[PDB]
Amino acid sequence: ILHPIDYAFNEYFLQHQLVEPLNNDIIFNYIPERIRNDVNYILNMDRNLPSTARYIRPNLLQDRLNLHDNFESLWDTITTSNYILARSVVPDLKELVSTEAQIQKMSQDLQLEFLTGINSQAANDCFKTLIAAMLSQRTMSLDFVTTNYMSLISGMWLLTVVPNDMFIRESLVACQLAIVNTIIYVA
Amino acid sequence: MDVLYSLSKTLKDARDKIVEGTLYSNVSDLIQQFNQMIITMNGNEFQTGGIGNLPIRNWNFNFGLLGTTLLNLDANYVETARNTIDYFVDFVDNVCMDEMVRESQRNGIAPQSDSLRKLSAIKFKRINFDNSSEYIENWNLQNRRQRTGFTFHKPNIFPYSASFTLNRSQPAHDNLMGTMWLNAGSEIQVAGFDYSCAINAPANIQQFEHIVPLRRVLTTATITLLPDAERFSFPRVINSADGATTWFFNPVILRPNNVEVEFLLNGQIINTYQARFGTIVARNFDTIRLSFQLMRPPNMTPAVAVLFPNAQPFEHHATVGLTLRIESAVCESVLADASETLLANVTSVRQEYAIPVGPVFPPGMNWTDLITNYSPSREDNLQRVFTVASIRSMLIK
Amino acid sequence: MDVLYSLSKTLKDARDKIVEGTLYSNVSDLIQQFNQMIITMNGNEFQTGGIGNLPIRNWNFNFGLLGTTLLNLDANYVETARNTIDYFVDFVDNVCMDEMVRESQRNGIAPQSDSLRKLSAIKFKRINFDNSSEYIENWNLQNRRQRTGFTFHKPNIFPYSASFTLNRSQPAHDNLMGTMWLNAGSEIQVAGFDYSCAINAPANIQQFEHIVPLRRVLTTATITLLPDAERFSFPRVINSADGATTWFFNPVILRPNNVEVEFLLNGQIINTYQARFGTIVARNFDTIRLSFQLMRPPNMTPAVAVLFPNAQPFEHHATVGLTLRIESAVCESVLADASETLLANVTSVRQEYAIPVGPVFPPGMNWTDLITNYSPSREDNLQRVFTVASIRSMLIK
Amino acid sequence: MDVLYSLSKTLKDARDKIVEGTLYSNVSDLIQQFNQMIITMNGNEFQTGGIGNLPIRNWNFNFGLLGTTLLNLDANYVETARNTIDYFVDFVDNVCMDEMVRESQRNGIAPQSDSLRKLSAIKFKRINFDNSSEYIENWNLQNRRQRTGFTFHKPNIFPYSASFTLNRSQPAHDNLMGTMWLNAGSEIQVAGFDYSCAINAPANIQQFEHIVPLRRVLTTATITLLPDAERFSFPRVINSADGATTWFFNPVILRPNNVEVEFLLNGQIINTYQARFGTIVARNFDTIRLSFQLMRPPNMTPAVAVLFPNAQPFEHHATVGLTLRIESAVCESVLADASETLLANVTSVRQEYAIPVGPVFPPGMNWTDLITNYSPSREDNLQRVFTVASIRSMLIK
Amino acid sequence: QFDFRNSMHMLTSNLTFTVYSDLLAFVSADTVEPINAVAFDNMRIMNEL
Amino acid sequence: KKMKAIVEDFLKRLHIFDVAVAPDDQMYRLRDRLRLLPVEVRRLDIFNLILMAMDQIERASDKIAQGVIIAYRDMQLERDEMYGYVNIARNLDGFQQI
Numbered sequence A: 001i002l003h004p005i006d007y008a009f010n011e012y013f014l015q016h017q018l019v020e021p022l023n024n025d026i027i028f029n030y031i032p033e034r035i036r037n038d039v040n041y042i043l044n045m046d047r048n049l050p051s052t053a054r055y056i057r058p059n060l061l062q063d064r065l066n067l068h069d070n071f072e073s074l075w076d077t078i079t080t081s082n083y084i085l086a087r088s089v090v091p092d093l094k095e096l097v098s099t100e101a102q103i104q105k106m107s108q109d110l111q112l113e114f115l116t117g118i119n120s121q122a123a124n125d126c127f128k129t130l131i132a133a134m135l136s137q138r139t140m141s142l143d144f145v146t147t148n149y150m151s152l153i154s155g156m157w158l159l160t161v162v163p164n165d166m167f168i169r170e171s172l173v174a175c176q177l178a179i180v181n182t183i184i185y186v187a
Numbered sequence B, C, D: 001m002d003v004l005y006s007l008s009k010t011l012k013d014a015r016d017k018i019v020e021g022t023l024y025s026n027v028s029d030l031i032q033q034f035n036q037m038i039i040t041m042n043g044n045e046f047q048t049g050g051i052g053n054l055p056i057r058n059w060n061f062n063f064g065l066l067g068t069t070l071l072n073l074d075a076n077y078v079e080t081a082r083n084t085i086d087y088f089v090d091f092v093d094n095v096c097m098d099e100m101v102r103e104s105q106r107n108g109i110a111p112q113s114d115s116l117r118k119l120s121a122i123k124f125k126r127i128n129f130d131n132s133s134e135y136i137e138n139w140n141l142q143n144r145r146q147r148t149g150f151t152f153h154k155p156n157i158f159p160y161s162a163s164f165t166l167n168r169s170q171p172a173h174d175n176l177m178g179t180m181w182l183n184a185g186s187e188i189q190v191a192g193f194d195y196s197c198a199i200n201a202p203a204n205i206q207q208f209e210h211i212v213p214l215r216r217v218l219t220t221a222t223i224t225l226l227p228d229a230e231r232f233s234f235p236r237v238i239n240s241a242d243g244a245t246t247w248f249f250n251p252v253i254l255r256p257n258n259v260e261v262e263f264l265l266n267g268q269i270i271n272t273y274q275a276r277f278g279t280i281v282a283r284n285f286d287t288i289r290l291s292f293q294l295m296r297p298p299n300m301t302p303a304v305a306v307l308f309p310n311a312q313p314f315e316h317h318a319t320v321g322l323t324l325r326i327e328s329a330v331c332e333s334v335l336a337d338a339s340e341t342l343l344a345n346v347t348s349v350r351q352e353y354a355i356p357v358g359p360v361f362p363p364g365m366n367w368t369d370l371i372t373n374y375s376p377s378r379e380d381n382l383q384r385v386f387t388v389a390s391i392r393s394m395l396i397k
Numbered sequence E: 001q002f003d004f005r006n007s008m009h010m011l012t013s014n015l016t017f018t019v020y021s022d023l024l025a026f027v028s029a030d031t032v033e034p035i036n037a038v039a040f041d042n043m044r045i046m047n048e049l
Numbered sequence F: 001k002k003m004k005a006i007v008e009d010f011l012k013r014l015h016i017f018d019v020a021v022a023p024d025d026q027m028y029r030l031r032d033r034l035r036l037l038p039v040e041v042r043r044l045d046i047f048n049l050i051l052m053a054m055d056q057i058e059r060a061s062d063k064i065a066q067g068v069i070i071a072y073r074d075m076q077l078e079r080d081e082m083y084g085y086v087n088i089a090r091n092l093d094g095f096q097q098i
């Protein structure tokens, strides 16, 4: 027994519920496709879903405000947050080369009549920074000392493997100019 | 008029779309429009009829809105909607008939019935919805003062005329030269005849002209021009110009020579076709001028030569004709064509309810008289009644 | 039938409105309708054909839904939609052909194909959508026992009939009085002839009448009436009433006199026009009575007086004719007209698949016989097949 | 083409639906489409014209999006929308004219104007709305190479040709026998005549045949077949075959005997009708073969025996005939017809702006020549220009 | 005014169901031994061992 | 009604933004872009319910009236079930409205 208006509200609620049937097929499709096809991960549906199982599917419509167009501050914050999350989820490297042995060989080869900042902490930090910056599309600037031609040698590989649009243009041109004018044109 | 069209359009859409089992997402917007119409019409009182035999009717609106919370409509919803739809359709029907049956010599384009005058008010402007039919969109364009156009298939642009003109004549009608014509609906049949077959004419060629002016300019017209007037190719006994006596016409058909068809606008040749039959296009014209010659055959086999002697006794009369049919056209003003039923609807309503003859239209909505004397007031009233007829036909069948 | 129409309408909307690049707000509701159609049809098996040479085809429905998370739909969306649209269009095609190639003496309105019988189930009712077409509108109306109306451009209402009546005759067939007529489609063409030119008739006037009864009541019809019958104005050699001999008809045309064209409804005169030609309106009628007179010309020039002697030999035979064309009309029942192609589609399907002649329709869908004997069962079956043919044409050419 | 059609459709909906007082829910989707169009078209520059007398025009787009924050539209909203709509409508008009007045020998289906080529880019695909119209639907189907179909009322498929063939003849033209036909638009009138009236023919029967091959395949065509050729049943003086003299034709009409109408595809009889007149159906054909006979009446009254002697002085010449009208048909290719106005629109634009004769279409868009030599390139260009003309007609009337 | 006939309705729903949220607790995922983990080209990611 | 409050609540509930710092032009751009998006179907349907029934809810209210006609003339009190005699006007017909 309801007023017509109350009945309208309740009827709308009853007729437009957000719950939908859930099955192993829906769960499997919810798993990202690339992960499903990757042979490194074995996925099994070891659970039985009764017929009376429901779920509310997320609303994953792509952004309607286009915060990447003319929202510099908001986009900077968004990219920073995604970068933090990606850093959290990137794995940690294991059994790196012995830092002391590598430092000793580098010092012997370079014969510095440079080796500062080389260690496992820095290696892991760089791994995470690269992967997370690529995931979040955070622009990453390059910090280096032009006198450290070893750092420039490493930056050669950096630029080879990391797309050039991931670096702020000034930093990219600085690194490339240092490389050319201290190694390549000189050689 | 826009409000009336919106009412009829809403009711037609409700009839078409509110059906059992249909998703409410299919008719959400329609039901919003229907509720808006009900809200706007509630609490208002209307009167229709009172002219001729059309009964005086009173309309009151105290309806309840329609539900908006089902996922799929059910039978209950359809019946609840239909009960209101019937009353609204009846109201629209009677308002349309009341508007059709009326006319005004001054400001014929404005509403004439009191119901439509009331709907002209600002309070009812909330009922507008859509204006997508040909006649309503032309109405709106005309009010906005832009170019309008109605596309007609076989437009009745020629007032019915059937007559002849004799350039050479005698009391005995034994030796005649002239033309005969029928201009009817969307066709012109003209036939120039000479009894002597141009025996004594200069260069044995007789020239014939026929000018048909139109009451309105036709644009982008497709026309069929054919070289024979089949209506004037058999023996006939016609009555003299003054009706005193009767004369005989025993035609023998020759090919029309030097056929020229000119379509003129403001007295200047816009299109011109020479010795070309079949489908032609007249882009913009208000007069059709047809010129054609009877040329005596320079060479005749004996059977042909025996027909045309050089003395008075003439038993066969050389005739050359043209037939011109306007298949399609576009006109700024409303007309009657072979495809639409608006003239039929208006005339049928007036005849059914025995409307006394008014100060504008001819008796019985005689299209021949109307298009003969197509005046500004007549055009305005005719467009108004045709628009109302289209609005009514959206609902009544 | 409504479910079949809705399947076709949603498929047409999908094939028109699902085009790459279009905003999703333009197809939100359409995609809701399409997904509901897919969900309802899924898990169903239909069988079509098996009559005549129509192939026996099986239809299993298992399709995924269309996506909803997209702003502007792209090539992937269009491809995935069109793959399903093709199958659904083919299924609708075959269902419609199966329906068209069948007839039933009893319950000709009820679905005949087992596929349409299945679709009549209440489970499929959720796909109803909007019944906006003229034929589906009339289908619903006649289901509810409401007024139906079909607008026709020159409807095919007169069964073909080319004949002549001889009110006066003898074996020599040299002194004949009577009428000739051709009724066909939308044109009546009648011509009363008298070989004696009413020399010995009271007041020198011969009366001719022509009654054409329609099988259905036409409403709001525009009619073009002309005062000559060009078909019976040239010399003829006609075989006698019993085929024993042949008689010669050498006409000379006079204007019809005291023309009266009256349109009657159940014997009552609804409309009447006296000596008026051009465009006229018949508001509601089912019989046409054309009365005219051959009046011997009171005054004649010698070239005419020669034609009509007092004695027997009548070389020239006086003839007065009328031509009547129903340009446009409205009918409660279904008919064949010039513009529409429903009769053509039904006949084409039946001929293509060599459907044996059933009990209801005449062989080869002969329209002359179908309209000469337009029984209620024939009307029911014809309306069903025409409605399904329009549904089919909504998707297929 | 699809994008241009979408622009025209969006503007037509804007003019129809954006009216004062209308509920915003009646327009919301259209407003989203309109703002999408404004966003896409902003910042682009277009140039139209420069061919013939068509003025050069430059178009720049910088418009603000229409609001979306009202319940009912007021005067402000309509006024703001109207200026944008007017500019866009003028732009669409000029683009359509510029595309219509152009043609190409190679790739005639491809866009020819700079504006339409620009619109064919990928940045403009965001405006597609809905391709509901028949011509755009067939355009998309032909691009996908699915089966297209255009429905025509009285299609213009027979190039105008009036001619005659003489199987028997002599210099004096006293004892001719043969056929005499007019093919024009949608009508074929063929008369077979014999001056001797089959006095010496085998079995007193003279056979007549007439073959009309169509340029394109017609489908599901409704035909009207009648047993006389009214056009060829009155006395005529006709130029001889080589034009060096004239002969006399004085017909007397008999019923055609053993009439057989065949509608043939690829030389195979698809439809055959024997001695059946009135409405008939041809489901699929590309040639029409009319066969008939003049049978000397076995029994004659004196008035006929006099007409038909044994010797050479034949004064009356026996004639049989047939008339065949294509009331409505379907064709995969585009054609001119009575009802539509696309050919008239194209020809009108070309004549108005004095477009020079190009390498594809005949001068003045002469339909007779075009259909006579309807090459694949002409079909492509004609479909392109007709589709553009339809797009234009959606806005211009 | 209160009208019983116009106020009495019949509300229909489901008898019972369970609504889940994680949607991936039903997926049991293991990883191949890291040494022999292949890249997109089906060769070991680190093949210098 | 300041849509800046709505935009601030939006950014706050996004949970990654320090709303106090967002520049002003970007806040107004965000408002402008939000004003252009179509409403979600469930929320819009609920709003339609409320907008169609709000007139009736307000009329049903007991602590407020819809207006007062003055009319400066002797008008007979109407007789109603809810109360013997009242100055109930059921419509403002025939009076200029302010």
Ligand SMILES: [Zn+2]
Binding pocket: B153, B338, C153, C338, D153, D154, D338
């Ligand atoms: Zn026609």
